[model samples]
Target: GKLPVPWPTLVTTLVQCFSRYPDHMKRHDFFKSAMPEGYVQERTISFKDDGKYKTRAVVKFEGDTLVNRIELKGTDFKEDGNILGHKLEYNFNSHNVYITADKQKNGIKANFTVRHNVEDGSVQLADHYQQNTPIGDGPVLLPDNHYLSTQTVLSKDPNEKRDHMVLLEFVTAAGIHGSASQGEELFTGVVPILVELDGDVNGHKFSVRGEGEGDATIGKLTLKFISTT
Candidate 1:
């Protein structure tokens, strides 16, 4: 695709903005209150004298503009009935990401794609107004999991009818909807970032596994800013 020339800068700025976004979600009472039983998300970030920052939980990138949302529900806690929604926006051309915790309160108004996305993707008009109405929660936290670089395996199945190892990546702006297994034992403290599915999709059953040995329990997975165009 022949992207606009200004896209470069837009992608750069967008990623920079995402990377610099304050970690208010870590201190959010709503997030804190939503934690499942025996689950906790502890965040650790580094600071630079010149303001350069990075986060392991959040992953930001740039390229063709594609917004993806992920919806997750823990069936064990179905009685509690908490829906964990996350929004992931990115530019494939530039590989920059624009992420937020809760989209309801902080929906992004895309005034300039070039300035916003570093002018990487194709655009219809040079001067136009576009409002990015957040459908679900913006890019935020998942229980805990690392970016899936390759297919992996889990000890158990999540729904009992999905597949082996769930491959995840942002596809669109709308988040996904699914529930965990009911009455099944979960990892002690670690939450699975990726899930292993059963043979058929009948019950939508699957099992989840942490990124690492204890990552599911010790780590928190959130949208992060990766790089600028």
Candidate 2:
């Protein structure tokens, strides 16, 4: 049951996005539906010396089977890459080995991939992963607010900022409803008003707050790092 915080955190976030919009979904699918393409979704992940971690990651999906370059970073890890899913098998419950990469790492050339064990909340690195029986319904345990879930997935200590922590970005949707729906674009010509805030949700830290505002309404905003305990 010992798994790195980032692996499950990243997997679940993507799972939530995929589950909500199974077709023609991209990174922007995470938001409502009327937000502009210029509105970017970014995530930052960090950790303290005592196993306490904080993260906010954003990714954008391009088309049905391909994704734009996605970024993942931390104190000891960094990846800026894309995913090829034509050979991939996925559903709201689980997905097969999804290939991902970054052109280089620490200035050296490299490639990487991961096979997620969604039922068990574990991920295997590379193509060598074997299919074990599905552990249970995959990613079903993820809360309604996946952004808040990322911040709460790891141990957090309010008194410390330890070494070797990292942050990154991922994707989402538009409009102002709770789920995906077709709506008129409200954020087209307007420049989105961005805000950054720090506070705690439940017992975990909500380090970053971002919002897109328009003439008569606020489209969508998110809170990161909320505790379950």
Candidate 3:
């Protein structure tokens, strides 16, 4: 698929925008006021910067909500849940990701595709729309672990494919919803560019990762999960 902007440029552009988003949920607060405890999990995506692994973004999914917090290169308490939803398509030989926040009328909108480059082992950019809505305190509609990996896609028509994507990760009630953001809703900002690569996904640790590249940006990300039993 064609891209609206260069893959490098698009990632830089989107991460910058997401950096300004409003963060209303906190770890303690999420446990205190959001929902009852059932399945608790946390994923921290860190990147190698300045000879150290620093946090780029992190997500906590449990009970009925998911809090995806994005803070490029700082450690101060910040805001923004940049990811609205993720649709993963697993083909016989490739994987595809469709993430979007495209229906937002009041803020930034994002609709992008990241595809697995089987030959290079990288998840390259496929397509996307710029600019965003949100399902705050609502169900993100993620697939339960039981159904997440068991699902498979098959094409009814030899020339057409519709069932490739399986909803395993973050998903909202509306399919794509971006929470209200700040800065549009402040001062110094770090430009963290994400050069997509499939190497981010980790199976050995029962987790996933997102890799960033070049300049002063985040270099790698890891999303780890813990069992609730």
Candidate 4:
């Protein structure tokens, strides 16, 4: 359905990344204080099929609305993070959150952003996010790639100007593709790429997870350095 030319903020959809409230209105006055009347949001996802065939999912929100959703899957699953999921498939879906200008203006809305935790949340960089993109076959891929998904660079490095992205590594659950591969384990780690954000990542809630479907826990992780490369 086509909406009117001018809309109100009261009807804008909201998804606070670090918000505690389930409802949007309580998080911030996303309609007024934050969003600039009109804005655009974009996001992407990618899957690799190799050693760490990652099945990735990314979500992008605008003000109080969801604008982008990315989901990438791989053919073979692995327990690593070096590969972008090799030869898996990928796809993407995103849009702008529109608001109708005739909605109500609650004073409490403006104070919500301060109360939410959108800024200091965890920055996840995984090829596979079971919650965002689930329901597939076979073990996880190391650098696996799947069709029907899209990949978007979340952040880029400032000093180097390269992508300041991270890889959320993972592995496949045991007892899937037969006993010959009984509980096969692949060693993995979190790799931080070029970062564009200007600030210290000292205490930021960095995280990486494996097989999120009741398989492993995903939460706060610290940024580590492997070499000078």
Q: What is the TM-score of each candidate against the true structure?
A: 0.19, 0.24, 0.21, 0.16
**Candidate 4 lDDT, tens digit per residue, 90-173?**
111121112212123211111011011112341212222122111223222121121111111122134533212222222111
Q: Each candidate: how many clashes?
A: 57, 39, 15, 74
lDDT of 4: 0.19
> Which regions of candidate 3 fall more than 4 Å away from where they truly are?
1-14, 18-104, 113-115, 120-131, 134-229
User: Candidate 1: what lDDT?
Assistant: 0.21
TM-score of 4: 0.16
The number of the candidate with the highest TM-score is 2
lDDT of candidate 2 over 1-229, digit per residue (tens): 1112322334332212221222332222323232222112233322211111222323222222111122323333222111111121222222222212111210111112334333344333332211111112221111121111111122233653431112222223222133233321232222223333232222333233223222212222122222111
- Would you list the C-alpha lDDT of every candidate in the order shown? 0.21, 0.25, 0.22, 0.19
- lDDT (tens digit, per residue) of candidate 1 on 1-229: 1111211111121111111111322222122122222111111111111111111112111121111211111121111111111111233221222233334543232222211221233232212122222223333232221111111111324563422222122211211111131101132243323211111111222222223121222222222211111
RMSD of each: 19.3, 18.0, 19.2, 22.6
TM-score result, candidate 2 = 0.24
Identify the superior model by TM-score, candidate 2 or candidate 3. 2
Q: For candidate 2, give the lDDT of residue 73.
A: 30
Candidate 1: where is the Cα deviation over 4 Å? 1-25, 28-32, 37-97, 101-163, 166-188, 192-229
Measured by C-alpha RMSD in angstroms, how accurate is candidate 4? 22.6
Worst 10 residues of 2 by lDDT: 102-111
